[PDB]
Amino acid sequence: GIVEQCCTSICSLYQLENYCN
Amino acid sequence: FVNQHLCGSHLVEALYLVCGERGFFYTP
Numbered sequence: 001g002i003v004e005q006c007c008t009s010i011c012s013l014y015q016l017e018n019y020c021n
Numbered sequence: 022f023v024n025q026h027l028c029g030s031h032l033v034e035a036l037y038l039v040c041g042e043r044g045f046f047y048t049p
Protein backbone atom coordinates (compact mmCIF):
# COMPACT_ATOMS: atom_id res chain seq x y z
CA GLY A 1 0.00 0.00 0.00
CA ILE A 2 0.91 3.66 -0.48
CA VAL A 3 0.71 4.21 3.28
CA GLU A 4 2.67 1.03 4.08
CA GLN A 5 5.67 2.11 2.01
CA CYS A 6 5.64 5.93 2.24
CA CYS A 7 4.22 6.77 5.66
CA THR A 8 6.71 4.46 7.40
CA SER A 9 9.73 5.13 5.14
CA ILE A 10 10.66 8.04 2.90
CA CYS A 11 9.70 7.81 -0.77
CA SER A 12 11.46 9.13 -3.85
CA LEU A 13 9.60 10.87 -6.65
CA TYR A 14 10.16 7.74 -8.76
CA GLN A 15 8.59 5.49 -6.10
CA LEU A 16 5.44 7.62 -5.95
CA GLU A 17 5.11 7.59 -9.75
CA ASN A 18 4.37 3.85 -9.57
CA TYR A 19 1.00 4.91 -8.09
CA CYS A 20 0.14 7.05 -11.12
CA ASN A 21 -2.32 6.10 -13.85
CA PHE B 22 -4.65 6.62 13.16
CA VAL B 23 -4.08 10.37 13.42
CA ASN B 24 -0.44 9.96 12.33
CA GLN B 25 -1.60 7.90 9.34
CA HIS B 26 -4.22 10.50 8.39
CA LEU B 27 -1.77 13.42 8.46
CA CYS B 28 0.69 11.55 6.23
CA GLY B 29 -2.09 10.65 3.79
CA SER B 30 -2.88 14.34 3.25
CA HIS B 31 0.71 15.03 2.15
CA LEU B 32 1.00 11.81 0.13
CA VAL B 33 -2.19 12.74 -1.71
CA GLU B 34 -0.79 16.18 -2.56
CA ALA B 35 2.56 14.71 -3.66
CA LEU B 36 0.89 12.16 -5.96
CA TYR B 37 -1.08 15.03 -7.50
CA LEU B 38 2.15 16.80 -8.48
CA VAL B 39 4.11 13.77 -9.72
CA CYS B 40 1.37 12.14 -11.80
CA GLY B 41 0.22 15.36 -13.48
CA GLU B 42 -2.30 14.84 -16.27
CA ARG B 43 -2.17 11.04 -15.96
CA GLY B 44 -3.85 11.24 -12.54
CA PHE B 45 -3.53 8.77 -9.69
CA PHE B 46 -5.35 6.50 -7.23
CA TYR B 47 -5.33 6.62 -3.43
CA THR B 48 -6.66 3.75 -1.30
CA PRO B 49 -5.70 3.60 2.42
Ligand SMILES: O=[N+]([O-])c1cccc(O)c1
Pocket residue numbers: 005006007009010011012031032035
Ligand atom coordinates in the same frame (compact mmCIF):
# COMPACT_ATOMS: atom_id res chain seq x y z
O1 LIG C 1 7.24 10.07 3.46
N1 LIG C 1 6.99 9.96 2.28
O2 LIG C 1 7.21 8.96 1.64
C1 LIG C 1 6.40 11.10 1.60
C2 LIG C 1 5.26 11.68 2.12
C3 LIG C 1 4.72 12.76 1.45
C4 LIG C 1 5.32 13.26 0.30
C5 LIG C 1 6.48 12.66 -0.20
O3 LIG C 1 7.02 13.17 -1.31
C6 LIG C 1 7.03 11.57 0.46
Ligand SMILES: [Zn+2]
Pocket residue numbers: 027031
Ligand atom coordinates in the same frame (compact mmCIF):
# COMPACT_ATOMS: atom_id res chain seq x y z
ZN1 LIG D 1 0.76 18.31 7.87
